[PDB]
Amino acid sequence: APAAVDWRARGAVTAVKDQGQCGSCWAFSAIGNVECQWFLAGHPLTNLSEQMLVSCDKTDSGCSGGLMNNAFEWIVQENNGAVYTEDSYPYASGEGISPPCTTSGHTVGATITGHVELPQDEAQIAAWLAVNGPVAVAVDASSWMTYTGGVMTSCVSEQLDHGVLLVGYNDSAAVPYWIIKNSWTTQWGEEGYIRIAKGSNQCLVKEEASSAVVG
Ligand SMILES: NC(=O)c1ccsc1NC(=O)CSc1ncn[nH]1
């Protein structure tokens, strides 16, 4: 496994988005993961629809929260592996109200066949990531509201409440770090991203890592 991996440099990651006033971070985490996997299977990088999940996935709870694993399971078992484009099913829950599910004429932006879970182990997550691309992870983000930059080293690591995307890591730095894509616009953190220290389970980053599998 390489000393550093950044899938942004390989053009595998879409622009940072805005979940707005909605507990839909689980959908942005899952969708962001699928977007990258679709690109790495050899297809164009495409914005996909979080709204599809917030409105249509009954197993999760829309703006009230959900799990990336449930989302992946829902896509495959309830939606034929279909993930819509953001273009044809745009995000509309930025204000907290989720529209009802529609199922006519939307465009399939990607097809998945399943998903895998990763061990609760940072080195093993890094090994998978370096080979297979960005990983959906859950974090404790309660100490993230004031973040403006730098490598976070004393993150509150007590309870999972937030879904994000691991896009890379750097083991060569003075303080090794993960590179994490958030869904809080580009005004938050480092141009919408955050670096947390790697190897000390900052923000419980290793506890619930998984990824969609493309077909
Ligand atoms: N923002 C989120 O919804 C989110 C994102 C990551 S965790 C989490 N919390 C929940 O999904 C509530 S249901 C649950 N079941 C087991 N743990 N949590």
Count every beta strand, where a strand is a DSSP E run of 2 or more residues.
Answer: 9
- Series of H and E elements: EHHHEEHEEEEEE
Bound molecules: the ligand NC(=O)c1ccsc1NC(=O)CSc1ncn[nH]1
Please name the fourth-level CATH homologous superfamily: Cysteine proteinases
Just name the CATH architecture.
Alpha-Beta Complex
Please tell me what the overall shape is.
globular
Rounded to an integer in angstroms, the radius of gyration calculated over CA atoms is 16 Å
CATH class type: Alpha Beta
State the CATH topology: Cathepsin B, Chain A
Helical coverage, percent range? 10-25%
PDB class: hydrolase/hydrolase inhibitor
Keywords: Hydrolase, Protease, Thiol protease, HYDROLASE-HYDROLASE INHIBITOR complex
Assembly: monomeric
Entry title: Crystal Structure of Cruzain in complex with the non-covalent inhibitor Nequimed176
